[model samples]
Target chain A: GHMTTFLIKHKASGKFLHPKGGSSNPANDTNLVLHSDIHERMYFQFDVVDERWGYIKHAASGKIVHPLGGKADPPNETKLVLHQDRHDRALFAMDFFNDNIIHKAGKYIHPKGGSTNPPNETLTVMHGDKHKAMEFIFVSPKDKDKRVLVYV
Target chain B: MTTFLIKHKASGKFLHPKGGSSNPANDTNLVLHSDIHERMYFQFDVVDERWGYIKHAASGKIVHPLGGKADPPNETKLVLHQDRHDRALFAMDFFNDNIIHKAGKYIHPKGGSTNPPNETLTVMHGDKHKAMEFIFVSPKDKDKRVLVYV
Candidate 1:
């Protein structure tokens, strides 16, 4: 009862702007785990493209973006940041740090007492620097501590 | 050349938590014809007591929280700043504006002439407190758009 794992089947698929095949360092399996049995939440912050929702363009570059685990040239304060490839230099990833949270062993800090809720594992794009630009958060069970790549 | 298709499979099967509906309208099918794909993103942003996303601040109260920032974004925003490296979070699964351009249709922009070189289609949503979120984007050319209802 201390561990649980389930094979998540691909429910659906979609297209993106950038080309895939980048070295998603820290590999999904090597991701940092964040779990808690208390009334707490986890957070991540980074620069992304659009503000609307879903996926957006890189604010500065016109390329699409996602997160990866790697050391930055100048170094980043956060463990997670956008993957910087020559073709795609978008910072359209997540920033801030509060989406994931767990309340206790039986209860979650979010809607259904689970860390992941509606937007817990969603995307956020920008809207030409207007009120359209958006951001995000993700919540999950309070007992685990690992990053789950939606579509690896 | 065809990349995606919104298929309708038997509902109430595996994707129940995603709504156990099998109607085509209940699911959005995706085909990865292009290997140049970047990432596969999902969104779960909706406002319902059964599936309501609650935030501690105002952004947490509304439907789409703009980057955890208040919709309008003010100093009084309920900033959801927590490190997710320790807890488990359920990742989830949008709207548009006027002159909305679906594929190459160009709702307001006619001629499709050049179409401002290129356009960005971002799908974003959040709660009132802006604590939670969802987002995605696509090009405004040679593409198709689909929507479903629960």
Candidate 2:
């Protein structure tokens, strides 16, 4: 099985993003938040949805993040919410500006008021040009002692 | 603009599974040849229609890791053929098995024999019950970095 795992760290705040409460919420309570530690909650499984897009899964919550109201974009406040299906809102283009992962969707996943004071701050996709807040870095954890054999 | 550079570990060879050098021919041998040519690098255009049906970078062909059928060992090598049905599609599940690519097909440098410089490489899809696995290693850097479906 091919599954890529990485720690999505915010470039601006230097904090790791995790789901608030670390569980699935049908009522949209499991919002994306930032943390300083590299726990199980911070491990995100990124799978290929298509050539240009993919789905990011929160390790703890087991839910995916998407813009609220689904496809409604631009002008529409990009409220990064949790979803069950691979809906349009769930699709994201994971690109890089230099070494930073850009959470692009018309705008970037901007924290409300650029506040890095505490957790539970909403992650909304803001329109306009690229900024430091939109950048994220993917760190592949190394075990260093793992090995497997292939038969002929 | 994302291209997948599939490097065969055992042989240190890349799978340049394309047809007619640069021209799109109807029939071509799907062999793992050496010498890093432009035909070797593949741009995987993943579509949302199937479970991860990928289109080849050059020929626009779909890569069927498992030629057809699930068992009985019909075909050992993966075929880069055209298809509308979901026969050639693959669900690329990434696992940390030390080896980057896994489909139970461990391809050797020569045709399973010893001869390097002039040998035409052969890829075989092995049985799952067996322990040995053929692993395809992906490049780690950004210049040749692109995600793939297994």
Candidate 3:
């Protein structure tokens, strides 16, 4: 299971911005915590540089149990579904899908406000999904940088 | 742009309880992250203690974007049939319906599992489906936890 606890203390406000041509408002910040029941072969499919549409998957024996985001190419994300398990390992797997897919390409949409506040937004990522796959993506960004956190 | 890094210092191993049954194993250890978007109203949802499901809407005033997580009586969550923004806020209304009715009105199966994924899992409150809404269901639970890369 993947879980995160974030405590952001801001002098005024914080927010995640919509990349270029993203959103009209970008000053509202967010504080959220999520915990997965298990870890599994999770997949990240989306064009980060494009719109805000992404999903996940649970892969086992090279097969995906459940597909979660924008539809992908080739076999697409609909058919390749895997079995659901409650004790699968959970990790952060971003940019896993090919970003240059012409049909699904778009502009880059950065997090709203781009970490305007200093250390107000703190993120902690854990490692290994149900299957100890990639590494961790942690952000200890500068005082003025918008810190993004990821767990493998 | 801001790049916030989250890392586990000691690399703690996760423990899982296998063998599926009525009592699904709940992993209460992972420190999940929540990366919320702007103009998005997702903060209003509260988990149903018994079923582990999210309650729809808070309470009362089922027509506008009210604050908190209390819904009206018989407060069944309003189901959203179209693709609309403001999912988090609309969910609160369903909570109100469930509470007022005093019965389980909604059924939310895990999306990440074998269940077929559906679109716009929101409950629109009131007739004409105007104003007042809550995020009875989230598109992806991973994002709610600020899982930037997951």
Residue A37, model 1, lDDT: 19
lDDT of 2 by residue, A21-123 (tens): 5543434535566666666656776655644356777755567777665664544345566666666556665543233323434455656456544344445
lDDT of 3 by residue, A1-118 (tens): 3422111112122321111111122111211111121122121222122122222221222221122222322222121122222212211133212111112222111212322232
TM-score of each: 0.18, 0.46, 0.19
Local accuracy of candidate 1 as per-residue lDDT tens digits, B93-147: 2232111111111111111121211121112222121111112222222123321
Output the lDDT of residue B90, model 1. Answer: 19
Find the candidate with the highest TM-score and give its number: 2
Q: Please give the TM-score that candidate 1 achieves against the real structure.
A: 0.18
Give the alpha carbon lDDT tens digit for every residue of A67-122 in model 1: 33322221212222233342222222222122221111111111111112222223
Which ranking of candidates, highest DockQ first?
A: 3, 2, 1
Q: Clashes per prediction?
A: 93, 16, 90
Measure candidate 3: CA RMSD.
21.6
Error of 2 at B98 (Å): 29
Model 2, residue A137: distance off in Å is 0.6
Worst 10 residues of 1 chain B by lDDT: B8-17
What is model 3's DockQ versus the real complex?
A: 0.05
Model 2 ranges with Cα > 4 A deviation: A24-29, A74-76, A97-105, A115-124, A141-152, B1-150
iRMSD per prediction, in order = 12.5, 13.8, 14.2
